Swiss-Prot record:
The active site is at 270 (proton donor/acceptor). This is Carboxypeptidase A1. The keyword Disulfide bond applies. GO terms for biological process: leukotriene metabolic process; proteolysis. Substrate binds at residues 69-72, 127, 144-145, 197-198, 248. The keyword Secreted applies. Keywords: Carboxypeptidase, Disulfide bond, Hydrolase, Metal-binding, Metalloprotease, Protease, Secreted, Signal, Zinc, Zymogen. The chain holds residues 111 to 415 of 419 of the full protein. GO terms for cellular component: extracellular space. Zn(2+) binds at residues 69, 72, 196. Carboxypeptidase that catalyzes the release of a C-terminal amino acid, but has little or no action with -Asp, -Glu, -Arg, -Lys or -Pro. Catalyzes the conversion of leukotriene C4 to leukotriene F4 via the hydrolysis of an amide bond. Its EC number is 3.4.17.1.
Length: 305
């Protein structure tokens, strides 16, 4: 509210509160955090990214996006906790301190602002963007099927009314193109993590093809380690593997795109739970979910540094 120290991390927040939170955090830690606007959503809402850095010029970076699918509230709530966590652990935790002393972390808490606002306003289970097409009465695109990676192939729908509609063409959604341009312009990202829910899974490329990535052995071992670390707090069990062998074929996914850009450490997290509550995860599970997930993310970060 008035300070990130009085902000209630154990409850779900609206878009305005999360945006106010960003300004508070930047005001409290000006030498570490800065807020960047990488674009504007379809409905004109600013798209913000928090940059955590201790200095340098274009240092190797880590990308983390959450809430690309709006109804997955546990992701945006985890993102807020993450932001605060970075500021409290720098200079306290030896490992995280070493990471921030050599690398920058870019965090996008609300990747799909329009959808998020909608879930609070009209439909709690809305997942797509809110772009309109004259071609249909239906609204929105599945932003995680809109990337240029096997775009339009099996694992996505060509129907505008579908929950998995991929869009008219790759990167048609400004919420996606804003990330694409930013990452390509930066040119020095080493890891790309996209957070979702639910299912308790840690996945790596690919989803659109059965082809195995040349870094499978390494990513599979990193995934195994991250899962072990995450489980150490509350015993939460995760499964890991490539997207297509673990779930099913899925085209136009973000990490398939990032990996094809040369970002080796591309992973997607599917948080709690396994179905008991699903997308409506109780607010009482926010902090413990965030705490365990942190352990997994840091593990991946340690391997990138």
């Amino acid at each position: 509210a008035r300070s990130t120290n009085t902000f209630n991390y154990a409850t779900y927040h609206t878009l305005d509160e999360i945006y106010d939170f960003m300004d508070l955090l930047v005001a409290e830690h000006p030498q570490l955090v800065s807020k960047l606007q990488i674009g504007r959503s379809y409905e004109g809402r600013p798209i913000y990214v928090l940059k955590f850095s201790t200095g340098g010029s274009n240092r190797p970076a880590i990308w983390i996006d959450l809430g690309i699918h709006s109804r997955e509230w546990i992701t945006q709530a985890t993102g807020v906790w993450f932001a605060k966590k970075f500021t409290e652990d720098y200079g306290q935790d030896p490992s995280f301190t070493a990471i921030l002393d050599s690398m920058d972390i870019f965090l996008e808490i609300v990747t799909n602002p329009d959808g998020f606002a909608f879930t609070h306003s009209q439909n709690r289970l809305w997942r797509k963007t809110r772009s309109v097409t004259s071609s249909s009465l239906c609204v929105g695109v599945d932003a995680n099927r809109n990337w240029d990676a096997g775009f339009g192939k099996a694992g996505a729908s060509s129907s505008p009314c579908s929950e998995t509609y991929h869009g008219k063409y790759a990167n048609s959604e400004v919420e996606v193109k804003s990330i694409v341009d930013f990452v390509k312009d930066h040119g020095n990202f080493k890891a790309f993590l996209s957070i979702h829910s639910y299912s308790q899974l840690l996945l790596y490329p690919y989803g659109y093809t059965t082809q195995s990535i040349p870094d499978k052995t390494e990513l599979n071992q990193v995934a195994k380690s991250a899962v072990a670390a995450l489980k150490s707090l509350y015993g939460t069990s995760y499964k890991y593997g490539s997207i297509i062998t673990t779930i099913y074929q899925a085209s136009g996914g973000s990490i398939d795109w990032s990996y094809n850009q040369g970002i080796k450490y591309s992973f997607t997290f599917e948080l709690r739970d396994t179905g008991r509550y699903g997308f409506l995860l109780p607010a009482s599970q926010i902090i413990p979910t965030a705490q365990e997930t942190w352990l997994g993310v840091l593990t991946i970060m340690e391997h990138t540094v």
